[PDB]
Amino acid sequence: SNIAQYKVIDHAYDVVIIGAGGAGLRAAMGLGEAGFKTAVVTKMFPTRSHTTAAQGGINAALGSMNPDDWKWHFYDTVKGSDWLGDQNAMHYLTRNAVEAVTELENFGMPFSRTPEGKIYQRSFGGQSNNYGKGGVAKRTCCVADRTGHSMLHTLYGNSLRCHCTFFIEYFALDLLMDKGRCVGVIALCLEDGTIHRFRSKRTIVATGGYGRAYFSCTTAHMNTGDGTALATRAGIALEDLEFIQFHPTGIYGVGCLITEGSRGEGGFLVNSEGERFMERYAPKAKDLASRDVVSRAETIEIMEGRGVGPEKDHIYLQLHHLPAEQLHQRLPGISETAKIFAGVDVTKEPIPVIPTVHYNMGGIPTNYKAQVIKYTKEGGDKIVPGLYACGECACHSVHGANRLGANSLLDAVVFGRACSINIKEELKPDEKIPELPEGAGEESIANLDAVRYANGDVPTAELRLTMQKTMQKHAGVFRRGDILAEGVKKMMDLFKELKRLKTTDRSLIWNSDLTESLELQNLMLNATQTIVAAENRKESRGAHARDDFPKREDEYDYSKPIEGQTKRPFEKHWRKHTLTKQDPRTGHITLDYRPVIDKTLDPAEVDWIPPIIRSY
Amino acid sequence: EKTPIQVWGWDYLMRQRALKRPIAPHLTIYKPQMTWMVSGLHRVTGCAMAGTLLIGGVGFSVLPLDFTTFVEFIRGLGIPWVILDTFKFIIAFPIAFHTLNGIRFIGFDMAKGTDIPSIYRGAYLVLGLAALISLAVVVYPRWERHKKATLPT
Amino acid sequence: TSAAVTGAAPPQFDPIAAEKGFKPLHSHGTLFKIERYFAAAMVPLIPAAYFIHGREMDLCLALALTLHVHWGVWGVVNDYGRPFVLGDTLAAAVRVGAYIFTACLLAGLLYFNEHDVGLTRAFEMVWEL
Amino acid sequence: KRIKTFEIYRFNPEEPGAKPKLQKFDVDLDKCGTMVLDALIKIKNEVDPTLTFRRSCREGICGSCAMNIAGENTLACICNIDQNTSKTTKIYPLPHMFVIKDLVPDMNLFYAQYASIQPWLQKKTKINLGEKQQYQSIKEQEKLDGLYECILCACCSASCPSYWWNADKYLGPAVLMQAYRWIIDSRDDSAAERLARMQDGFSAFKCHTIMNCTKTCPKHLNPARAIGEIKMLLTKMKTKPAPLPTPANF
Ligand SMILES: Cc1cc2nc3c(=O)[nH]c(=O)nc-3n(C[C@H](O)[C@H](O)[C@H](O)COP(=O)(O)OP(=O)(O)OC[C@H]3O[C@@H](n4cnc5c(N)ncnc54)[C@H](O)[C@@H]3O)c2cc1C
Ligand code: HEM
Ligand SMILES: Cc1ccccc1C(=O)Nc1cccc(OC(C)C)c1
Ligand code: SF4
Ligand code: F3S
Ligand code: FES
């Protein structure tokens, strides 16, 4: 850190939360409730966190509309994870879904109500009553079109009562580590350019995902997957990074989300020939089939020319057939959102949409206790002390290969709640606040000091763009071994351009040029790991679909009957998590693979669902 | 006697001064709109009249002048058939506009007429009746005295 | 290096802890009510002054006007007579002045009714030009 | 070469004894997106990266990008660039706020005031958390429509001249409407004590019905109005029809 001097500021808390998104805030409320001196660290105001932009709804088996068993939720979630989903985590999610969302009503979330006065639910993507046998399920509870805005503002409000101390606009640089143990976090106070070291017995990572690793995305600009990168720079393997979900109905132009609620209310996808083409691709579910299918099904129509508009390159979402007193009631957000960015009167015209990057199931590997883990091939799942994770940045996993619709706001909440529940217990008040080793994150700063005065000939702005495109091309909805190899070749050579970086802005106080550069740093780690994982995965499963490996590789062939066959070895078949372990400095990436936890938590409360062929 | 938040609000203002932090512009930069321009002209006139009543009530008291000398003094120049009623219109309008607008500005204390159509309508409505009543009050006796120069009896 | 100083938690408003002690119930609300009532009552009055002139009207005008302008100037004195931009006691000077303005106003108007044309007659005479 | 020219407010606290500035930035509208924010980014990305400013969402739902654009307080991301290349779009920060750097202002007071209204659900009978849905009717919950949407951009408090003057004491439109939002929520019980906290002559009443809040607001909402009901509520010219009856089969 030679070229400057820095104001270093220590602290001491019980538990630090890097994140003020749904998960981080819920996590905080429970810890305040428990009585911990809880520091919430966020690189922007909590209400600006991504959650806010969420639209469709949040999932729970409430049966405000009709009878519902959470076990039917649990099913559609395991089939949604294309059996790459650790079911012990999914069991936790779907069991407590009804308690957690009810909590939110009890925190003053203004859920839309049915005439009965109950929480109005709608239908959504990839759900169904009676274990896939029955109808299309109505579990997706909502505040009409704007569920995530109202969930966050509510969760935040209630966290002003938890006596939790807020560090707002603080960019977290690294997880402060002591040989296996997370003793705290380091950050940069944007307000005064001071550096802050937070000592803590625990550390919850709720940073969200890396939607900006791709060119087009519904995500917000601050989806740079920092927490995911922090873990890597502390020496942890990330999980299932190649599984990037593509949301079907992202607007043609900017890529802003048009909800799946727009489809769950009775809207549908129409090609250049005026065919509701999803009725072919999904005989049963139609336009409420899972997102990886619907987004693929779009791309097929485009790539075969029946795409619409002046480039025959996107398609339509249709709402000019639903009654306008429902559009206005159930979809006012997208109504205006479409009317602004597309100029579309949704009651008169369709909305030009296209598959778009949205959610990263992939993240920091954890158990069901939302605790970060490492995975030796012999020792197994060895946890990381003083470290927890939840939200989009985590991979429990409750989404394996494909996240279900309306499940993340729940994943954010339930496992945020879980973080505190699980910490309240396993933390004990005799355990003193850990001291920092001398010269902690002297590198963390050095790194910053480098980027701050960046001297090379590549503008930080341009190196991002070329990453984003190099990505957009190679790791699309349909990917192939030759493309991916050729992607990895470019991405790894873009990584070497990091030493050739340029930044003009030199100031400490509110340097959006410097901070964005650290985001790019973090994004490049995620991205590199995303594509090397994808290149290597020789199968089609969930979001990640390989033209050259278009069957779901499983222990058994599951189309044929089970008995009579003979289970493959762990090496050949791909029912396993992808654990990329990048060398933060050089960029070398090594892999290893970890089993899917098939068992539930209580075999007495529910049965583990056998892998059947995922059809909608 | 401050509420706990308004205490904090002060301590803040201090802390904000401390940092020599500049303040964003406002009147300097903000655009003219019929919401607050009207607010200005309600309060501009409101005051002007009260300052008149002081400059009038206390001014004529302290000074030796009675009002009857003043009314005669101006007829000294005996300014044009126009320029008088101009000043009459200038004197009616602050009372006219204000008093009308007072019924409107009470409205928005009751949530009555607070949407942008109701705001912008009322703005023209009040200016209309203030233009009418001040012109009508001023050009009525003037059109009764020039109804002597030629009259029946 | 990490030869740091230990810092403190950032300044923040605790609405639960500020709830200790706070009993202020000096319900200004009922005063607002009467300001507006009165002003609505003056809606017929201005017409009445146009039509029914006289010394006793002057008195209703000079009583009401001094009472409504008193409430008015106090408003404008609080908006612009700010402690921040004036310093505490100097703001209290304007503050007190808002009451001086009222008492000087009424006396100014009372002198004029009782030793001059009066409000009503003053308009007749200037409209007569 | 449809070169739009921009006059952006500039300022550097780093630079010793420096003062507010105005910089002119030119932008090729053919090489740019349709929204103001796109240019500001384009500018940071291609021209001067020191141009510091707040963004997060692109869809106008976060509240981060509040600022002044051609004399009005609005969100950049969903405000359209003025296509007339002979003219300039004049970009300043949110009026009468202390500026940190360029278009970034300190919020904390605004944030702190919205914290003082106890923006969360309060009920006298201690109910259990994840146990039961509380009752609220379609008519009841629909009241909040117009209130719950506020993203806390502060375009409205930044436009209110009464806020400019007495910002420390007068809560300002956006914060008030959230105070109101929690008042009329049927499920909410401690609604009198909420009024109790802004009974004084500044907190609430210093609203001189100017109406910029409602006119400037990028989400088309109406604070002036909810202030209305507060004035009626505080004067006891009105009060809320208390909770509807939660039926015994619900
Ligand atoms: C357009 C859209 C619509 C959606 N709709 C739905 C829906 O209807 N239902 C549903 O279930 N899910 C939905 N999702 C998914 C869901 O909203 C998110 O995945 C979820 O809200 C993530 O919450 P989180 O707490 O993990 O992190 P986020 O809400 O993403 O916030 C991340 C937090 O981490 C902090 N952070 C990041 N980096 C740093 C750093 N370096 N230092 C310090 N702090 C940092 C940020 O300040 C931020 O507060 C939607 C997503 C999008 C994009
Ligand atoms: C006759 C009917 C009148 C009505 C209904 C009326 C109503 C009102 C109202 C409601 C206000 C408060 C508005 C606010 O707070 O912004 C006000 C303020 C004021 N009025 Fe009047 N008024 C009337 C006549 C007058 C007259 C004749 C004067 C003459 C001097 C006057 C001077 C003022 C002043 C100085 C204020 C100051 C506060 C301000 O502008 O904000 N008013 N009036
Ligand atoms: C503060 C106040 C209360 C009630 C009625 C009017 C005002 C008032 O003068 N606003 C105001 C004050 C100064 C300037 C301004 O316009 C600027 C945009 C030029 C408006
Ligand atoms: S009200 Fe309209 S303007 Fe005032 S904050 Fe909420 S949204 Fe921004
Ligand atoms: S702009 Fe200003 S004073 Fe009252 S109603 Fe709107 S706040
Ligand atoms: S950046 Fe989200 S409000 Fe425009």
What CATH class has A552-616? few secondary structures
For the A435-551 domain, the top CATH level (class) is mainly alpha
Residue D140: which CATH number? 1.10.1060.10
Q: Which residue from A500, A511, A468, A464 is spatially nearest to A487, judged by alpha carbons?
A: A468
Which SS3 state, helix, strand or coil, does residue A598 take? Answer: coil
Using an 8 Å Cβ cutoff, are D11 and D99 in contact?
yes
Q: Which residues contact A80 (CB under 8 A, 6 or more apart)?
A: A126, A290, A399, A402, A403, A404, A407
Alpha-carbon gap, residue A370 to A389, rounded angstroms: 6
* Same-domain status, D125 and D100: no
Token duo for residue D83 = 């296509």
> Residue A564: what are its φ and ψ, rounded to 5°?
100, -35
Cα dist. C88→C91, C92, C95 in Å? 5, 7, 10
Spatial contact of A355 and A250, defined as CB atoms under 8 Å apart: yes
The CA distance from B57 to C112, in Å, is 6
| Nearest atom of ligand 2 to the alpha carbon of C46 | 1
Is A502 in a helix, a strand, or coil? strand
CATH 3.20.20.150 fits A251-354, yes or no: no
Do A196 and C7 make contact, defined as CB atoms within 8 angstroms? yes
Q: Per DSSP, what are the bridge partners of residue A250?
A: A257, A354
Backbone angles phi, psi at A384, to 5 degrees: -110, 115
- Residue at A158: amino acid letter: N
User: How far is residue B38 from each of residues A182, A270, A290, B95, D211, measured CA to CA in Å?
Assistant: 61, 51, 56, 14, 10
Instruction: Consult the annotation and say whether B26 binds a ligand.
Output: no
- Residues, chain B, total? 153
Q: Is A594 a catalytic residue?
A: no
Same domain, D161 and D201: yes
> Which parts of A501-588 are beta strand (E)?
501-502, 545-546, 576-582
Mutation target among B1, B15, B35, B41 for the D interface, most CBs of D within 10 A: B35
What architecture is domain C1-129?
Answer: Up-down Bundle (1.20)
With beta carbons under 8 A apart, name residues in chain B contacting D229: 111
Name the experimental technique. Answer: X-ray
Does D98 contact B23 at a Cβ distance shorter than 8 Å? yes
Å from CA of A358 to ligand 1 middle: 11
CA distances to A16, A98, A579, B60 from A39, in Å: 5, 28, 30, 68
Closest by CA position to A165, among listed A262, A266, A37, A329: A37
Q: Rg of chain B's alpha carbons, rounded to an integer?
A: 23
Tokens of A120: 């109005």
Span from the CA of A19 to the centroid of ligand 1 (angstroms) = 9
D172, D136: one domain: yes
Examine the domain organization and report whether D44 and D167 are in the same domain: no
Pairing of strands A364-365, A394-395: parallel
| Contact (Cβ atoms closer than 8 angstroms) between residue A257 and residue A218 | yes
D6 with D49, same domain?
yes
Binding site annotation covers B61? no
Do A39 and A200 form a contact (C-beta atoms < 8 A)? yes
State the DSSP string of A62-107: --SSS---HHHHHHHHHHHTTT-S-HHHHHHHHHHHHHHHHHHHHT
SS3 A256: coil
Indicate the residue of C5, C7, C15 with minimum beta-carbon distance to A160. C15
CA distance linking residue C39 with residue C32, whole number of Å: 11
Inter-chain contact D62–A100, Cβ cutoff 8 Å?
no
Alpha-carbon gap, residue A69 to A59, rounded angstroms: 13
CA distance D104 to A507: 14
D144, D219: one domain: yes
What is the spatial distance between Cα A29 and Cα A37, in angstroms, rounded to a whole number?
Answer: 11
d(C-alpha A361, C-alpha A291), whole Å:
13
Residues D101 and D113 in one domain: no
**Catalytic annotation, pick one of A122, A263, A291, A575:** A291
Nearest to A206 by CA among A415, A384, A362: A415
CA neighbor of C80 nearest in space, from B50, B47, B22:
B47
Instruction: Give, in words, the CATH class of A1-250+355-434.
Output: alpha beta
Of C12, C28, C79, the CB nearest to D162: C79
- 3-state class (DSSP) for residue A135: coil
Distance CA C12, CA B15 (A): 13
- The C-alpha atoms of residue C57 and residue B92 are separated, in whole angstroms, by 19
Contact present, A169 and D107 (Cβ < 8 Å): no
Query: CATH number for the domain including D48?
Result: 3.10.20.30
CA gap D156, D163 in Å, rounded: 10
- Report whether A23 contacts A372 (CB < 8 A): no
Helical residues (DSSP H) of A178-290, grouped into ranges: 226-233, 261-264, 278-281
Same domain, D111 and D191: yes
- Residues in contact with A9: Cβ distance below 8 Å, sequence separation at least 6, in sequence order: A189, A194, A195, A196, A197, C4, C5, C6, C7
- Domain final residue pick, D56, D89, D106: D106
By the 8 A CB rule, do C118 and C58 touch?
Answer: yes
Domain boundary assignment for chain B: 1-153
Cis peptide before A123 (omega within 30 of 0): no
Task: Tell me how far apart the alpha carbons of residues D52 and D67 are, in angstroms, rounded to a whole number.
Answer: 12
DSSP-derived 3-state class of residue A456: coil
CATH class for the domain made up of B1-153: mainly alpha
What separation in angstroms does the CA of B64 have from each of A177, B58, B67? Answer: 89, 11, 10
Pick from A246, A258, A243: which is nearest to A217 by CA? A246
User: For residue D169, what are the domain limits?
Assistant: 107-250
Please state the domain extents for chain C: 1-129
CA distances for A135 relative to A66, A98, A290, angstroms = 11, 20, 15
- In whole angstroms, how far apart are CA A211 and each of A243, A244, A389, C63, D82? 12, 9, 18, 70, 30
Q: What sign does the dihedral A286-A287-A290-A296 (CA atoms) show? A: positive
Tell me how many degrees the CA angle A113-D115-D196 measures, rounded to the nearest 5.
Answer: 85
Please give the span between the terminal C-alpha atoms of chain A, in angstroms, as a whole number.
Answer: 56
Window A:94-123, CB contacts with D under 8 Å: 96, 98-100, 102-103, 105-108, 110-119
Taking a C-beta distance cutoff of 8 angstroms, is the pair A601, A93 a contact? no
Q: What angle do CA A112, A116, A120 make, to 5 degrees?
A: 30
For chain D, how many structural domains are there in total?
Answer: 2
In chain A, domain spans:
1-250+355-434, 251-354, 435-551, 552-616
Span from the CA of D112 to the centroid of ligand 4 (angstroms): 16
DSSP A477-494: SEE-HHHHHHHHHHHHHH
Q: How far is CA D162 from the centre of its chain?
A: 15
How far does the CA of residue D172 sit from the closest CA of chain B (Å)? Answer: 12
